[PDB]
Amino acid sequence: GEDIGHIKYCGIVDDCYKSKKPLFKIWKCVENVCVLWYK
């Protein structure tokens, strides 16, 4: 299935500049733990 298709495994923009927003919605993340807020 295709030849190109790599994952952008990164942290919080450190070296892989020009990210593509690997997150989903991002509400409240702290202590290496992401939690919702809207709902």
Answer whether 10's CB lies under 8 Å from 17's CB. no
CA distances from 38 to 11, 23, 26, 27, 35 (A): 23, 16, 10, 7, 10
- SS3 for the chain is CCCCCCCCCCCCCCCCCCCCCCCCCCCEECCCCEECCCC
Q: Residue 11 and residue 14: Cα distance in Å, rounded?
A: 7
CA distances from 36 to 8, 20, 22 (A): 23, 21, 16
Domain positions in the chain are 1-39
Please give the span between the terminal C-alpha atoms of the chain, in angstroms, as a whole number. 38
